[PDB]
């Protein structure tokens, strides 16, 4: 039912410009804040920008401040990211996502190639296990964040998916072998019995304070 369809990526020279589009369907687009999150090749997820329902409030990561502009056209159910003065450091897959701080749906990602914060730390950074094993992943916040903690799963080549929100709530449709626990500064995601489709990188993310930050990712290999 919910789809976020991205377009507009490509290859540009340093200093160049691109515009990304994210077409939404299956939910009431104008009722939700919308966001952009990027991922440089082989690296973790990084929040880039967000925009309120009617466009009056926007936010940008410090590194793109003044060069990127987020906008939306509610009458076309479309979110945009205008990217000027592109730098090598901007090379990444760009995801749009629904909501401000709990990203319950993600676009498929579009590749752009140019050629005080709350720190989240995950343990382990990677692990190799076998079908049927129990896996636990720890996420620590550098300050107390109560229950404002989400978990995402990202299979190789794919967009992230929300698994757990607000520390312990199972997102609709997620298998019950996934569970979340914890509070304050220490949180855990548990996969009670690892299935073959669970090989993926898992990310925690605090939803309480700007700028939004992700853990570095835990790669679960088989």
**Which residue's entry shows tokens 């502009």?**
69
Same domain flag for 14 and 51: yes
Cα distance between residue 213 and residue 188, in whole Å: 17
Residue that terminates a domain, selected from 54, 83, 114:
114
For tokens 């129990």, the residue is 134
Per-residue exposure over 123-133, b if at least 16 CB sit within 10 Å of its own CB, e if not: eeeeeeeeeee
DSSP-assigned states of every residue in 66-115: TTEEEEEEGGGTEEEEEE-S--GGG-EEEEEEESSSS---B---EEEEE-
CB contact at 8 A, 213 and 119: yes
In angstroms, the CA 214 to CA 192 distance is 23
Are β-strands 68-73 and 58-60 bridged in parallel, bridged antiparallel, or unpaired?
unpaired
Residue 198 vs residues 78, 79, 156, 166, 195: alpha-carbon distances, Å = 32, 31, 11, 21, 5
Nearest alpha carbon to residue 216 among 154, 149, 125, 152: 125
Same domain, 33 and 136: no
Domain span at 107: 3-114
Same domain, 147 and 45: no
Resolution (A): 1.9
- Partners of 125 in beta bridges: none
One domain for residues 205 and 184: yes
What's the CATH number where 40 sits?
Answer: 2.60.40.10
């Amino acid at each position: 039912e919910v789809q976020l369809l991205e377009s507009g990526g490509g290859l540009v020279q340093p200093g160049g410009s691109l515009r990304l589009s994210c077409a939404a369907s299956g939910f009431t687009f104008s009722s939700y804040a919308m966001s952009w999150v990027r991922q440089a090749p082989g690296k973790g997820l990084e929040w880039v920008s967000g925009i309120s329902q009617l466009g009056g409030y926007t936010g940008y990561a410090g590194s793109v401040k003044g060069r990127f502009t987020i906008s939306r056209d509610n009458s076309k159910n479309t979110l945009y990211l205008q990217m000027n003065s592109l730098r090598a450091e901007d090379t990444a897959v760009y995801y749009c996502a629904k909501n401000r701080a709990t990203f319950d749906y993600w676009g498929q990602g579009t590749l752009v190639t140019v050629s005080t914060d709350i720190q989240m730390t995950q343990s382990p950074s990677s692990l190799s296990a076998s079908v049927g094993d129990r896996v636990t992943i720890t996420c620590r916040a550098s300050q107390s964040i109560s229950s404002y903690l989400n978990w995402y799963q990202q299979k190789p080549g794919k967009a992230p998916k929300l698994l757990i929100y607000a520390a312990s709530h199972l997102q609709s449709g997620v298998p019950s072998r996934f569970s979340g626990s914890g509070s304050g500064t220490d949180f855990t995601l548990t996969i009670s019995s690892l299935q073959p489709e669970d090989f993926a990188t898992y990310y925690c993310q605090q939803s309480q304070h700007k700028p939004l930050t992700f853990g570095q990712g835990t790669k679960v290999e088989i």
